[PDB]
Design a protein around this ligand. Structure first.
Ligand SMILES: NC1=N[C@@]2(CO1)c1cc(-c3cccnc3F)ccc1Oc1c2cc(C2=CCCOC2)nc1F
Length: 371
């Protein structure tokens, strides 16, 4: 899969995108890779933020579905017109498929001023596609129409420009060290998983594990932060505050309301704790744990300054880029599981590294899921 390595680009905080083509002749667009949604939707009008946009009038293979779609989401919205066309991924498998495409014709707070992408590729399942689950997602079409295996993997490398790899239809073993460890996909909608335990510097938060997954926990390339349910965020910040109490910081820093700075090259990584999430394993009463460093959860904002990139949530746990940049993540749709391995590109120091370890004995893991 050498050709797919390094096929993702981005800017810090603006997501990861992959190059795609749509239509005949092919129109090249950069498309945000989002495992937290399920629509393929592209700019189709000259919004001033856009470098380029889909011009359906130039495509001989465009077909109008004569149906609108309206997509508000928590931080923005887009609306558009549904159709189909031929779609390929230049630095992906050597195939062309006919996919659903929403031509975006109105939006608010969707496109980012200064970003280099023009659309979104929702890689999650049909259950959360708009307008409904009859609108086949891209990846479903790709697998249905070709011999591409039903999985993809993401190595998000971070930095400012960011880079990474989306391996479509397989796994590139050069992108990780150690073994992959798999957690089940609980339900095929979001990439929903179950967190069974949480430790800060090896110290158990000791919460009822249902709280960790209230009302769900997902793996989401389209979210920057690690987001935690309110009650869990409360407890985690308390523990992270206690662990790092060598230095003191304003209450606003922990709420993401202000930054913290140090003299360039002297950031005291050592005073900040590691964070471990234990995930439901593949076997009864078996779990494994993934562990990230402050290098993952303290995000640079360009003295070296940083934002606290763990935040509270009313929509459950979201394992965003803060988690994913530690790991090579395998979305093994064929076996309804997600694999984690230590990423060969993750940022660490001479003392600590991100880790994926197991097996551990964990009882009552089925009670951790919210119903
Ligand atoms: N996972 C996730 N994707 C976002 C929000 O959270 C989304 C994120 C971004 C974004 C912004 C900054 C950095 N990274 C990003 F992915 C941009 C557009 C966008 O646009 C959409 C998103 C989510 C959705 C959803 C639609 C219906 C199903 O649930 C989500 N729709 C969007 F249009």
């Amino acid at each position: 899969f050498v050709e797919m390595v390094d096929n993702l680009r981005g800017k810090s905080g603006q997501g990861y995108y992959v190059e795609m083509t749509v239509g005949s002749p092919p129109q090249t667009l950069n498309i945000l890779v989002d495992t937290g949604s399920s629509n393929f939707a592209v700019g189709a009008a000259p919004h001033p933020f856009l470098h380029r946009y889909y011009q359906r009038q130039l495509s001989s293979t465009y077909r109008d579905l004569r149906k609108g779609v309206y997509v508000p989401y928590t931080q923005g919205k887009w609306e558009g017109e549904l159709g189909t066309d031929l779609v390929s991924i230049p630095h992906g498998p050597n195939v062309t498929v006919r996919a659903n495409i929403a031509a975006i014709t109105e939006s608010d707070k969707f496109f980012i001023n200064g970003s280099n992408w023009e659309g979104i590729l929702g890689l999650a399942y049909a259950e959360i596609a708009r307008p409904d689950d009859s609108l086949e997602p891209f990846f479903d079409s790709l697998v249905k129409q070709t011999h591409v295996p039903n999985l993809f993997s993401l190595q998000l490398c971070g930095a400012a420009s960011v880079g990474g790899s989306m391996i479509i239809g397989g796994i590139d073993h050069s992108l990780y060290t150690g073994s992959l460890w798999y957690t089940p996909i609980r339900r095929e909608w979001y990439y929903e998983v179950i967190i069974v335990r949480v430790e800060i510097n090896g110290q158990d938060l000791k919460m009822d594990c249902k709280e960790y997954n209230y009302d769900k926990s997902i793996v989401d390339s389209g979210t920057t932060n690690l987001r935690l349910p309110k009650k869990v965020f409360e407890a985690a910040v308390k523990s992270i505050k206690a662990a790092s109490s060598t230095e003191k910081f304003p209450d606003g820093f922990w709420l993401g309301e202000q930054l913290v700075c140090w003299q360039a090259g002297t950031t005291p990584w050592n005073i900040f704790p590691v964070i471990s999430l234990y995930l439901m394993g593949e076997v009864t009463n078996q779990s494994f744990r993934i562990t990230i460093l402050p290098q993952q959860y303290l995000r640079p904002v360009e003295d070296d300054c940083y934002k606290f990139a763990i935040s509270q949530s009313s929509t459950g746990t979201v394992m965003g880029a803060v988690i994913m940049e530690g790991f090579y993540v395998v979305f093994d749709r064929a076996r309804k599981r997600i694999g984690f391995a230590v990423s060969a590109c993750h940022v660490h120091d001479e003392f600590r590294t991100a880790a994926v370890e197991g097996p551990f004995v964990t009882l009552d893991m089925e009670d951790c899921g919210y119903n």
